[PDB]
From a paper:
The protease plays a crucial role in viral replication by cleaving the polyprotein into individual nonstructural proteins. HuNoV proteases are cysteine proteases structurally similar to picornavirus 3C-like proteases with a chymotrypsin-like fold. Their active site features a catalytic triad with histidine-30 (H30) as the catalytic base, cysteine-139 (C139) as the catalytic nucleophile, and glutamic acid-54 (E54) as an acidic residue which orients and stabilizes the conformation of H30 (15). The substrate binding pockets S1 to S4 in the HuNoV protease, which accommodates the P1 to P4 residues of the substrate, are in the cavity between the BII-CII loop (beta strands BII and CII, residue 102–117) and the DII, EII, and FII beta strands of the second beta-barrel.
To ascertain that similar conformational changes in the BII-CII loop occur in other GII-Pros in response to rupintrivir binding, we first determined the crystal structures of apo GII.4-Pro Sydney (2012 GII.4 variant) and GII.3-Pro to 2.4 Å and 2.6 Å, respectively, followed by their crystal structures in complex with rupintrivir to 2.5 Å and 2.71 Å resolution. In all GII-Pros, H115 is mutated to a glycine residue. As observed in the available crystal structures of GII.4-Pro, this H115G mutation results in the loss of this hydrogen bond, causing the BII-CII loop to adopt a closed conformation. This conformational change in the GII-Pro causes the sidechain of the conserved arginine-112 (R112) to orient closer to the active site. By contrast, the GII-Pro apo structure shows severe clashes with the P2, P3, and P4 groups of the modeled rupintrivir molecule. Isoleucine-109 and methionine-107 clash with rupintrivir’s P3 and P4 groups, respectively, while the P2 of rupintrivir primarily clashes with the R112 sidechain. In addition, the fluorine atom of the P2 sidechain causes steric clash with valine-114. Thus, loop opening is essential to accommodate the P2, P3, and P4 groups of rupintrivir.
Residue numbers in the entry:
A (entry chain B), B (entry chain C): -1 to 172
C (entry chain D): 3 to 123, 130 to 172
D (entry chain A): 3 to 125, 130 to 181
Write the structure that this text describes.
């Protein structure tokens, strides 16, 4: 098992994609996945939420605990070079997909014509970054990148882009 | 103000579509949007959940309340013929779309190659049923049909099918 | 893009981007204490008012993401159009409205002219804040805009869509 | 039509529907108390055991939903195939494995044969488990996935793996 169920339960639908409950009050997602026409997130009006955007990484701090079931989790500003992280994808079908990804340097690139920055990852699934069965889909944005630092699990960011050419994905960081 | 924010909050993403919290433990949705591969619905394993499927209408009663923020609501089998209900669509962008729908007879259709049943509904939008901006999309299935009987709101079913070429829609009931 | 993105908050109500340079709205929704619309001095905006139908032709294209829509002066009598109401709650509300003859009526102590419509639609009624929202129907494959919401008779059944 | 749906539990492990009527799995995963497989008596099933590879051709199509797929005896050396692991947790884990020479591996006093490979994850827990035996190895040729065998064993370190194929290929005897 690459990810305990206590970590899969933290991944929940948000807007056009997903997001991750780092802590009962902290929630990370991709900026372009945010539902920009919504007036509330998880029952809290927007004005009450501390929204901090670092590129396409988005951090939401809620005034009161939203997910009491989760515990506080370590958040690293990207993984160390060469770390084999796991992109924990949830699909609308209910499928869980731990996609192994070798994390590389931080870079910026044009993906859809937009310029996306973040830590580069090279999917270790045998397919290109864009594959319904073996890779990512546009709807997977917001899903977390996790690795194991000693005995602890560490979120290094969230899925923000998948290059069409090969196995390159972008993990939005900090 | 067609529906108060307390009613829109009950509408939440579920699988390939949406669902509606009638009470803290009651959750209705469309059968064909259920995440079939998911072992857990809202953190609760599907084995502890009471699932009752009537046609393409699905009811789920959970062991312990999850949405303790919403009060119990009246759920009845369809609406009196001629009633002007509102299909309360949520979109991944966060937009809210209350589409007026004059409810008609209970009947069955051939939709997408499958046989579907429920209370028919003529959209009073002035546009087609499968319009992208002014009508329903396949991803709206599970959203509620709600009308107001006197001073009480009454949910009558969930959107399960939209006919091509006209304002006809299907509200799965029971 | 979505047609709703063409409906933007404007003054005390709304307005509709027909083309990247043409913006239709209701006059009684226009702000008074403002000499700039969407970032252009008024005197450099071509502003034409026909009763309560105001149109603003801008010097350069403000909304380059939108196509050019067909703006006709009302719909043929009996046509079922859609009033696209956007609400501050985030609610997008298409209301069916059968359009009829031209009408001049005293509503809210004010003589309003336009094309009359009859809404075919708990509270799915018009509010004062809706004024400026567009009336639109589909002719063949072409979405036609026929005017903007300018008035609503008491009872929420009869409405006036400013035109011309 | 997802390829993961072709992977289903079988005995103590998994197996893969190559076609509506063809099923492949690992030999040691098969239940020894076998009176029927997928509702078909064994006498009616055409069974081919090549070492740790087991092919079951059923008299009539069982999985009418799946389309015919190409089964090859291994992949070309250097091919980055994909081991499609299914877990009872619901996790679908595609693991990249660089495929190499055909080989036998010493394990449990015996020998297991197949095309060997090395997982691209190297040496957190993204490795195989014995319960994964029977899961398919695949690789994309052209625009079609090709199954090359099923997982049967991993070396002690868990990086070297054995993809059991239809069988070992020998040297031709000419004339």
């Amino acid at each position: 098992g690459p990810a305990p169920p206590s970590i899969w339960s933290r991944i929940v639908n948000f807007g056009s994609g997903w997001g991750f409950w780092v802590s009962p009050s902290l929630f990370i997602t991709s900026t372009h996945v945010i539902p920009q026409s919504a007036k509330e997130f998880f029952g809290v009006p927007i004005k009450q939420i501390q929204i901090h955007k670092s590129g396409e990484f988005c951090r939401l701090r809620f005034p009161k605990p939203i997910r009491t079931d989760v515990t506080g989790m370590i958040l690293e500003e990207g993984a160390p070079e060469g770390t084999v992280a796991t992109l924990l994808i949830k699909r609308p079908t209910g499928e869980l997909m731990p996609l192994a990804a070798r994390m590389g340097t931080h870079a910026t690139m044009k993906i859809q014509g937009r310029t996306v920055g973040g830590q580069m990852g090279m999917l270790l699934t045998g397919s290109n970054a864009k594959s319904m069965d073996l890779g990512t889909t546009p709807g997977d944005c917001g899903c977390p990148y996790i690795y194991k630092r000693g005995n602890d699990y560490v979120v290094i960011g969230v899925h923000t882009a998948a290059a069409r050419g090969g196995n390159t994905v972008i993990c939005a960081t900090q």
